[PDB]
Amino acid sequence: MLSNLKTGNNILGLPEFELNGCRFLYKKGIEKTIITFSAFPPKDIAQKYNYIKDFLSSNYTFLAFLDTKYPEDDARGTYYITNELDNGYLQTIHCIIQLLSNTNQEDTYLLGSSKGGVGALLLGLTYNYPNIIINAPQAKLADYIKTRSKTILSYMLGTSKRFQDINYDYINDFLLSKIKTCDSSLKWNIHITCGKDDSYHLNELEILKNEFNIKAITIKTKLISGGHDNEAIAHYREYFKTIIQ
Amino acid sequence: MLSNLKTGNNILGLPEFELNGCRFLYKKGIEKTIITFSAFPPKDIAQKYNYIKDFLSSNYTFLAFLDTKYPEDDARGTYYITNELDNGYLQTIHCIIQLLSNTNQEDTYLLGSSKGGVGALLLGLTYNYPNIIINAPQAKLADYIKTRSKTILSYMLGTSKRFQDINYDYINDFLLSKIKTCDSSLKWNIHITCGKDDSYHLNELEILKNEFNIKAITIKTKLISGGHDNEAIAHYREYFKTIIQ
Amino acid sequence: MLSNLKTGNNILGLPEFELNGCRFLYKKGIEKTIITFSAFPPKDIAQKYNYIKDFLSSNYTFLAFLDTKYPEDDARGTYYITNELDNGYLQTIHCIIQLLSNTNQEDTYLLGSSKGGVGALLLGLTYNYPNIIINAPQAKLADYIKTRSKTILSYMLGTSKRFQDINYDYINDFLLSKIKTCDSSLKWNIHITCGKDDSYHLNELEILKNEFNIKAITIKTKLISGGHDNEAIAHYREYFKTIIQ
Amino acid sequence: MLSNLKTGNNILGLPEFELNGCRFLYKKGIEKTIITFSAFPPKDIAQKYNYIKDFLSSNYTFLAFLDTKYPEDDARGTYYITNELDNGYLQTIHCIIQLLSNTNQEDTYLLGSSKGGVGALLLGLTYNYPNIIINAPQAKLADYIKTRSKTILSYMLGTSKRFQDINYDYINDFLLSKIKTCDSSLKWNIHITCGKDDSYHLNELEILKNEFNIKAITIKTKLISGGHDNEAIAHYREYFKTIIQ
Ligand SMILES: CC(=O)N[C@@H]1[C@@H](OP(=O)(O)OC[C@H]2O[C@H](OP(=O)(O)OC[C@H]3O[C@H](OP(=O)(O)OC[C@H]4O[C@H](O)[C@@H](NC(C)=O)[C@@H](O)[C@@H]4O)[C@@H](NC(C)=O)[C@@H](O)[C@@H]3O)[C@@H](NC(C)=O)[C@@H](O)[C@@H]2O)O[C@H](CO)[C@@H](O)[C@@H]1O
Ligand SMILES: CC(=O)N[C@@H]1[C@@H](OP(=O)(O)OC[C@H]2O[C@H](OP(=O)(O)OC[C@H]3O[C@H](OP(=O)(O)OC[C@H]4O[C@H](O)[C@@H](NC(C)=O)[C@@H](O)[C@@H]4O)[C@@H](NC(C)=O)[C@@H](O)[C@@H]3O)[C@@H](NC(C)=O)[C@@H](O)[C@@H]2O)O[C@H](CO)[C@@H](O)[C@@H]1O
Ligand SMILES: [Cl-]
Ligand SMILES: [Cl-]
Ligand SMILES: [Cl-]
Ligand SMILES: [Cl-]
Numbered sequence: 003m004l005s006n007l008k009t010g011n012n013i014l015g016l017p018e019f020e021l022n023g024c025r026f027l028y029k030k031g032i033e034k035t036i037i038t039f040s041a042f043p044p045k046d047i048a049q050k051y052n053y054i055k056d057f058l059s060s061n062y063t064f065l066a067f068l069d070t071k072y073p074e075d076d077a078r079g080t081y082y083i084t085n086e087l088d089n090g091y092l093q094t095i096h097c098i099i100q101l102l103s104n105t106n107q108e109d110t111y112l113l114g115s116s117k118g119g120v121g122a123l124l125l126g127l128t129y130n131y132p133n134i135i136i137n138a139p140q141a142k143l144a145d146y147i148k149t150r151s152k153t154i155l156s157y158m159l160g161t162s163k164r165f166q167d168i169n170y171d172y173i174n175d176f177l178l179s180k181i182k183t184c185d186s187s188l189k190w191n192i193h194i195t196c197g198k199d200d201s202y203h204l205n206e207l208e209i210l211k212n213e214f215n216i217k218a219i220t221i222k223t224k225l226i227s228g229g230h231d232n233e234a235i236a237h238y239r240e241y242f243k244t245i246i247q
Numbered sequence: 248m249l250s251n252l253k254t255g256n257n258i259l260g261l262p263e264f265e266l267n268g269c270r271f272l273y274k275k276g277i278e279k280t281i282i283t284f285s286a287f288p289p290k291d292i293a294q295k296y297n298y299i300k301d302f303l304s305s306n307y308t309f310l311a312f313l314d315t316k317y318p319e320d321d322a323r324g325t326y327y328i329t330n331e332l333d334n335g336y337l338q339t340i341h342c343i344i345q346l347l348s349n350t351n352q353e354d355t356y357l358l359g360s361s362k363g364g365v366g367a368l369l370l371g372l373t374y375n376y377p378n379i380i381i382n383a384p385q386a387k388l389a390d391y392i393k394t395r396s397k398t399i400l401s402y403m404l405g406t407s408k409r410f411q412d413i414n415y416d417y418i419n420d421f422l423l424s425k426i427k428t429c430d431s432s433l434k435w436n437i438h439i440t441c442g443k444d445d446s447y448h449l450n451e452l453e454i455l456k457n458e459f460n461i462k463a464i465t466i467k468t469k470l471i472s473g474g475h476d477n478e479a480i481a482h483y484r485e486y487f488k489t490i491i492q
Numbered sequence: 493m494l495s496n497l498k499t500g501n502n503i504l505g506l507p508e509f510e511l512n513g514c515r516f517l518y519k520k521g522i523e524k525t526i527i528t529f530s531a532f533p534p535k536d537i538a539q540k541y542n543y544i545k546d547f548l549s550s551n552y553t554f555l556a557f558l559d560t561k562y563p564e565d566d567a568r569g570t571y572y573i574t575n576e577l578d579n580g581y582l583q584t585i586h587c588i589i590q591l592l593s594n595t596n597q598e599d600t601y602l603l604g605s606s607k608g609g610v611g612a613l614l615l616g617l618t619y620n621y622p623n624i625i626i627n628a629p630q631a632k633l634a635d636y637i638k639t640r641s642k643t644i645l646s647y648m649l650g651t652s653k654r655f656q657d658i659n660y661d662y663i664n665d666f667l668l669s670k671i672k673t674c675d676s677s678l679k680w681n682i683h684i685t686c687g688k689d690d691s692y693h694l695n696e697l698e699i700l701k702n703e704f705n706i707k708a709i710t711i712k713t714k715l716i717s718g719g720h721d722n723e724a725i726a727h728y729r730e731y732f733k734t735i736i737q
Numbered sequence: 738m739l740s741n742l743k744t745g746n747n748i749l750g751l752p753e754f755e756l757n758g759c760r761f762l763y764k765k766g767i768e769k770t771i772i773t774f775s776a777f778p779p780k781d782i783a784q785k786y787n788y789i790k791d792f793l794s795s796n797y798t799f800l801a802f803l804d805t806k807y808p809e810d811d812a813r814g815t816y817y818i819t820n821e822l823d824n825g826y827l828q829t830i831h832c833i834i835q836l837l838s839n840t841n842q843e844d845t846y847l848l849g850s851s852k853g854g855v856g857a858l859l860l861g862l863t864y865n866y867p868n869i870i871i872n873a874p875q876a877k878l879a880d881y882i883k884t885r886s887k888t889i890l891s892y893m894l895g896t897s898k899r900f901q902d903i904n905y906d907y908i909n910d911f912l913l914s915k916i917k918t919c920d921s922s923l924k925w926n927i928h929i930t931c932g933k934d935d936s937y938h939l940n941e942l943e944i945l946k947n948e949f950n951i952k953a954i955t956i957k958t959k960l961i962s963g964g965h966d967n968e969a970i971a972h973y974r975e976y977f978k979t980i981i982q
Contacts, residue, residue: 003349021345022338086652090335093267097342100266103248152906162576163821164662165655170899172654331653409660416642493839511835512828580825583757587832590756593738 004028004102014054016066023071024094027051028102031063034246035103037131038066039114039121042078042150049078052118056239063104067095069121076153081143082121083158087172089128096129107131113242115235116140116203119194120177126192127184135193135245137238138200138230141209144174181213192221195241197234199227249273249347259299261311268316269339272296273347276308279491280348282376284359284366285313287323287395294324297363301484308348312340314366318402323395325403326388327366332403332417334373341374352376358487360480361385361448364439365422371437372429380438380490382483383445383475386454389419426458437466440486442479444472494518494592504544506556513561514584517541518592521553524736525593527621528556529604529611532568532640539568542608546729553594557585559611566643571633572611573648577662579618586619597621603732605725606630606693609684610667616682617674625683625735627728628690628720631699634664671703682711685731687724689717739763739837749789751801758806759829762786763837766798769981770838772866774849774856775803777813777885784814787853791974798838802830804856808892813885815893816878817856822893822907824863831864842866848977850970851875851938854929855912861927862919870928870980872973873935873965876944879909916948927956930976932969934962 004019011018016027038052051066058064069079070091084090103110111133112122119136120143126134140146147155159169192214196207207223214221224241228234249264256263261272283297296311303309314324315336329335348355356378357367364381365388371379385391392400403418404411437459441452452468459466469486473479494509501508506517528542541556548554559569560581574580593600601623602612609626610633616624630636637645649659682704686697697713704711714731718724739754746753751762773787786801793799804814805826819825838845846868847857854871855878861869875881882890893908894901927949931942942958949956959976963969 003351004346006351007345021342087654088331090338093335093338094342097266097339098346100252101249101343101346105248106251148902152903156903156907160652162650162655164577165652165658166900167897168655407657410656412638413642413646417646493841494836496841497835511832578821580828583825583828584832587756587829588836590742591739591833591836595738596741 013051014058016054016058021098022094024091024098025068025071026095026098027054027064027066029058029064030102030104031061033062033105033109035063035065035099035105035110036060036246037099037110037112037122037125038064039082039112039118039125040066040068040079041114041116041118045076045078045151052115053113053239056243063102065099065102067098067121069117073153073157076151076157078151078154079117080154080158081117081147081173081176082124083173083176087158087169087176092125092128095125108133111135111242111246114139115238116230123177123192124180127180130185130188132189133191135242137195137226137234137241138197138203139177139194139206139210140203141178141206142174143176144170147173178209178213181210181217181219184217184219186217186219190219190221192219193224193241193245194221195224195226195234195238197228197230197237198225199229200234203230258296259303261299261303266343267339269336269343270294270313270316271340271343272299272309272311274303274309275347275349276306278350278354279307280344280350280355281305281307281309281491282344282355282357282367282370283309283311284327284357284363284370285311285324286359286361286363290321290323290396294322297360298358298484298487301488308350310344310347312343312366314362318398320402321396321398323399324362325399326362326392326418326421327369328403328418328421332414332421337370337373340370353378356380356487356491359384360483361475362391368422368437369425372425375430375433377433378436380487382440382471382479383442383448384422384439384451384455385448386422386451387419388421389415392418423454423458426455426462426464429462429464431462431464435464435466437464438469438486438490439466440469440471440479440483442473442475442482443470444474445479446474448475503541504548506544506548511588512584514581514588515558515561516585516588517544517554517556519548519554520592520594521551523552523595523599525553525555525589525595525600526550526736527589527600527602527612527615528554529572529602529608529615530556530558530569531604531606531608535566535568535641542605543603543729546733553592555589555592557588557611559607563643563647566641566647568641568644569607570644570648571607571637571663571666572614573663573666577648577659577666582615582618585615598623601625601732601736604629605728606720613667613682614670617670620675620678622679623681625732627685627716627724627731628687628693629667629684629696629700630693631668631696632664633666634660637663668699668703671700671707671709674707674709676707676709680709680711682709683714683731683735684711685714685716685724685728687718687720687727688715689719690724693720748786749793751789751793756833757829759826759833760784760803760806761830761833762789762799762801764793764799765837765839766796768840768844769797770834770840770845771795771797771799771981772834772845772847772857772860773799773801774817774847774853774860775801775814776849776851776853780811780813780886784812787850788848788974788977791978798840800834800837802833802856804852808888810892811886811888813889814852815889816852816882816908816911817859818893818908818911822904822911827860827863830860843868846870846977846981849874850973851965852881858912858927859915862915865920865923867923868926870977872930872961872969873932873938874912874929874941874945875938876912876941877909878911879905882908913944913948916945916952916954919952919954921952921954925954925956927954928959928976928980929956930959930961930969930973932963932965932972933960934964935969936964938965 007019009018114122115137119139226237252264359367360382364384471482497509604612605627609629716727742754849857850872854874961972
């Protein structure tokens, strides 16, 4: 039962649950379901639940998810991809939302920035969540992990030297593949912001945009002030609060 | 949202749900949680939910599960094993139980006969559901599938002629591997009945018994009247009723 | 020191040593160095040193090698290929021979049947041992392991489903690749016998012969009585004793 | 046969051997076994065997090792790491020591300065050689190689531009990983001297000290006169002589 899934941790008065290695916060509300995804924290900093304070007074239904618990020596997550490089973790997140949420899919909103934005896209494109409002997601996943933690990257690549380049390309294109295989008939409502001084993720956004374009998916984009920093996040928070209401 | 997972089918008044290709019935109750697994139906007959009548008049929480929906040519299930020959389907069933059940695992009872009994064992050994009360499960799953449907077996073995032998053995030993890798420290409460005229499955039970013996796990076995038929099912239904009550 | 490498096991009065996971027997003699390789024993039977009784009274220098100690649940060896599918085990065998032998390379003889014959070829072709007198070796290594133990084959293939076919082909061609890359200017002295009723390995010998042929390597072959059994081994023993003397 | 491994080179009367690309000197003695490792020579100067004079008049067993023979453009060694960035070279050195030495590991002493001290640590931590008496080893190996030879570093990083950063970090942490994975239960006897004017390597020792500290292994350190120069080498030579005698 859900009460038995409690980890015994409380974040800002919200109990933490864990199911199949997937840690999450859950608050039952009304009208809408808000889903947030964690980004890469700094090294030796624990993974953080995102945007709790924006919706604690809102009385919306709120679910916040963390990334996986691996690798053990740098436990900042594996981009919501399993040790087997498949959808097993996304599948668990989907089951949690579908059973705990008390609103329709059209009234559910996936939120996240950077790696958290990618997790939102991965879940949304795999399982048909139409409302995705995210900031500065990556396009080439392996290239970015390389710039954040060699420990996590080498972990996902695996031990066998003969498959390192193959696994690199597979991880690098994991999100682009989800775009290539998604349902183009869905009424997608995808919003992507990006700090105007975040040149790296401005280029990543164009890579993502080209994939959506050829799938006949028109997304909304907005340039905000800042780089890949707390200033962009501040304006991204103002953005998703606006369109949600 | 649970109600949005409905398929439109209705079995004895209970609405059918589907999540990630997993079809189930659900009735919320109190005190105990009863889980039932589907067995092979006759060819061209729809997969059936098991033991609805024995618990529909009860006040317990009730979850009934079917097997997978593939292959389309003979959609009688793949022994709760995915297309990829992994735990993805059992993981979905686990999440459904954990989020919809309102009792401890110690107050949860897994029921099933033949393939249904295997599905109960597969789930219970993977995720530590201690109470498993089943009838006449198989030990060599691939050997049995071969007798019931060449179409299903051929689908599970895959297109590559070189890996057909490999996949066959893997499927054949899928349940035995779960026994070898389960948690011996848990206080298992496993009951396995078998018809005294069910010579094939009496030998299958001897194989299962040995694997448990090697793992220093003791189970309860009981011989009942009948073969691999409705006579055994009747006495097994009575047996589980007395253990549960 | 060599005395400290003793495992504390004695085979027919010969002490067993182990260096870097490589178990071997060593007897210091004169004139010639005899090297033997173990074949696949029956299931649940320990790996056996080969042809001890042929050379115990000979006073030649004698070294007998076993295969690796993996997988742990079917420890009959991995065709002298490491867990990483590379030459690390062959490398250890080479170091042992080069340092413990007291005769030239031209006075060293590699012996073995079936998998033992393949180990002799793998070592001989990698490190330029000219004298190789073997019986009924395999050509397609993975095809043959499949027919002997699914446990060992699945072990060498690895866990990642996406690389099973790639690793299958890599193991299957491991010996053929060694032939393709060997030194064709060496004065090779390769003798391969095969039981005349061993149709399977008669075809394997032709596959090997074609690879040698295009490398301009002429080998000697002899048909002996028997299949892949103790009768062929008996005549193979008579064969290598003859040409050695 | 050992004598057939000779290269034709002769260093101070001792004949040079080579096995699997590993060049070594060997003098059989009694009571103790001394192992020395080569450090970086000047550009276009041949790799040199270390501490021959200190032990050539001694009655101990003596083994002196050089680094690898690649890259051909600047063949000053790759820090005892193979082309494949694995333990293959250290494995060869281990086999040479184990089969040619006539003493226990407790009576074996690993000596070396700078890169030679790293090679001693790499071997001793991988294969449990407890007595390691070295001077001024590096901690971040790739950082140091970069200062000594761009040609060697570029060779070790590989042709693929995408894996150059990855391989750099892997090489950089190769020694630290050996510390993290070594056997803490062994009675290590590690002595590390460093010149008081060798500010770069005093900081490198602080990094090494911390890794040992975390692994609950205590080592002996001593400050000697000089920098990273022949003055330190002189006092370190005296130091090891007193510990050994
Ligand atoms: C940029 C880079 O490549 N750096 C690497 C370095 O990576 P590192 O992991 O060691 O550290 C990265 C980076 O962290 C520090 O800078 P920031 O704090 O600006 O970025 C951290 C992190 O912020 C977001 O994730 P988050 O931590 O979960 O924060 C979410 C928000 O939610 C909180 O609750 C809020 N707090 C409130 C309301 O009170 C907010 O403050 C939070 O922002 C993500 N950013 C975005 C835009 O989404 C995430 O992407 C981001 O990484 C800083 N480190 C310090 C001060 O210690 C900085 O120096 C550091 O670079 O390691 C690699 C090694 O490979 C290097 O190559 C490179 O330096
Ligand atoms: C053929 C096949 O595909 N069988 C598989 C089965 O494999 P399995 O591993 O379970 O058993 C194989 C096979 O074993 C028994 O038949 P054999 O004894 O004729 O073959 C065994 C074995 O002999 C040689 O290796 P060795 O054991 O190391 O013997 C070397 C010699 O040295 C000894 O010292 C001598 N003894 C003296 C002097 O006193 C000799 O006796 C020894 O021969 C190898 N053979 C050759 C030609 O080189 C090796 O290749 C060979 O395998 C028998 N098993 C019994 C009686 O229990 C037989 O039934 C069995 O088939 O498992 C797979 C599952 O995937 C099946 O598909 C298939 O049945
Ligand atoms: Cl991030
Ligand atoms: Cl059935
Ligand atoms: Cl064999
Ligand atoms: Cl140096």
